[PDB]
Each structure stands twice: as C-alpha cells, then as structure tokens.
Amino acid sequence: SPYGPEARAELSSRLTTLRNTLAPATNDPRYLQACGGEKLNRFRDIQCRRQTAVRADLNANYIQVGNTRTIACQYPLQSQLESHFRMLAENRTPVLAVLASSSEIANQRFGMPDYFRQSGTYGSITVESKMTQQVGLGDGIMADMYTLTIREAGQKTISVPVVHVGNFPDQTAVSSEVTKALASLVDQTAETKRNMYESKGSSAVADDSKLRPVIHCRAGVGRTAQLIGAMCMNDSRNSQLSVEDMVSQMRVQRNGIMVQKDEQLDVLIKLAEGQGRPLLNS
Numbered sequence: 001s002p003y004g005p006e007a008r009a010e011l012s013s014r015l016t017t018l019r020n021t022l023a024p025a026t027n028d029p030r031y032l033q034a035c036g037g038e039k040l041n042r043f044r045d046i047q048c049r050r051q052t053a054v055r056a057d058l059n060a061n062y063i064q065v066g067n068t069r070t071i072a073c074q075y076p077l078q079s080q081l082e083s084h085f086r087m088l089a090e091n092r093t094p095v096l097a098v099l100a101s102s103s104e105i106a107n108q109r110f111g112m113p114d115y116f117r118q119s120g121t122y123g124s125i126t127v128e129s130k131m132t133q134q135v136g137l138g139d140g141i142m143a144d145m146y147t148l149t150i151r152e153a154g155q156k157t158i159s160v161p162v163v164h165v166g167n168f169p170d171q172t173a174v175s176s177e178v179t180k181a182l183a184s185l186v187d188q189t190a191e192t193k194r195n196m197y198e199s200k201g202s203s204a205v206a207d208d209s210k211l212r213p214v215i216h217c218r219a220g221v222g223r224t225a226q227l228i229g230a231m232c233m234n235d236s237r238n239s240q241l242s243v244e245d246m247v248s249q250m251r252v253q254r255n256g257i258m259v260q261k262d263e264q265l266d267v268l269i270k271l272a273e274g275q276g277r278p279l280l281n282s
Ligand code: VO4
Pocket: 092, 156, 201, 202, 203, 204, 205
C-alpha cells in the first residue's frame, strides 16, 4: 500500500497541482525578473523564486529540504560568470556539483561555458582550475574532480572542490545506485571542506546562507533535483521527511519544475522505499 501504484499516483497528483499553482505569470512577483538588460533565465519557462534568490543577476536559489541546505542553479550564462564565481566564493562553497555532461558542455549551441575545467579571468575575478581525483559511481559513470581557486582583489581567496559527472547519461535518468554513490561523494567532499573552514574558525559556519553545496545541470531542475533529494535522504536529521515534503519544498523554493521528469521521481521513490521513508503526508 505505502509504495503501491495508488500511493504513487496520489503523490504525482499532489505534485502536479503544485506545479500548476507555481507556474509563473507575466512579471510574477514570486519570481526574479532581470534588473536588467542581460538575459537572466537560460530557459524562459524555468524561473528563479525571488524570495530565495541568491543574487539578483543569477538564476540560483537557496533550498532547504528538511534540514539540508543547498543552492540549486542553472548552468551560468557566459555573461553571468563573474557573478557566479562571486556567489561561489562568498558562499565558501564546500562542493560544486556539475551534472551537465561533457557532451552537453561541448555543444556550443547550448552556450554552456567550460568554466570549471579551464582557468580564466572574468571581470575582476581570476580563476585557476586544477584536476584532482576521479571516482567511479557505478554503471561506468565517472565523477571527475577539480579544485577552483577564485581570486579577486579585496576578497579572501577561496578554493572550491568540484564534482563533475562528465559522462552523465543526458538522455536518461541515472539509477538509484548511481544517485546514492553521487550523493555520498558530494556529501563527503562537502564535509571535508566544511571541516577545514571549521578548523580555521571561519565566520561562515554560523551563517545560514553560507557553506551550501551548489548543484547544477543545464536548467537546475531535473538531475539537480534528483541529487538534492538523494542528499536530503542521506542526512541523519531528516527522519520522517516524506517524498511529498521534499519535492514540495524544492518547488516552492526554486520553481514548480523541480524534479522535472517522472523518471527522476521514480528514483526518489525507490530511495525512500529502501529507507521505509513515507511517500505521502498523513
Ligand atoms: O571571511 V571568513 O573565511 O574568516 O568567515
């Protein structure tokens, strides 16, 4: 009963209603509008909740699912790179997880700058990329890791660990097993980096808005949301948080598309079932 087709249909029904309610109107007060002149949204129908927006010129949101705090964003546009790097630095980002594949990034029609595998200067910010480890996730899926060192006069220099799933199967969903392995890697990477900041006595440890994992694919609503859901299920503090809760929270805090595909919701359901975690509220 709890994970049967009836329960799953009811979950989908509730989530579909929510998506409709959250659909953006013209000049919607709930969503971030360009401020302005440059393109803000990579996709016109995939918008950034205003009240949880990280920066006025980025499509990026603070998200809290149960107790788990992250930032979900779109792949930054070329014009957004300086702002994106400043976001990463100010957040003392303990991990940046990029779920757009190498094939997607290499497709120049998609306008996705190769900002983390190359070094460069973006306005006042200079970034150095270094290759680190490579971790297999299962099914031949590989996480390539980097460190991004972000330098800017007047700012403390920040190094950001990057987890890039270079061969993400961008046509299809990754399995629950691969998702689990990825969530574990991303969480572990973040824990190691956060610990460094704690050991140095960083003031960012006491700030709700900082030390958040940053996760994006192309739009930051599909693969991104699947990973965030898996990360929240890894969090010891989230007992009894339902799948309905998780997805509703992602949607209200970013946009109604979070967990874009039924295929992605299937993975979250499987992970929840493995834990005896409820699908529905009440
Ligand atoms: O600006 V701090 O890395 O001392 O929180």
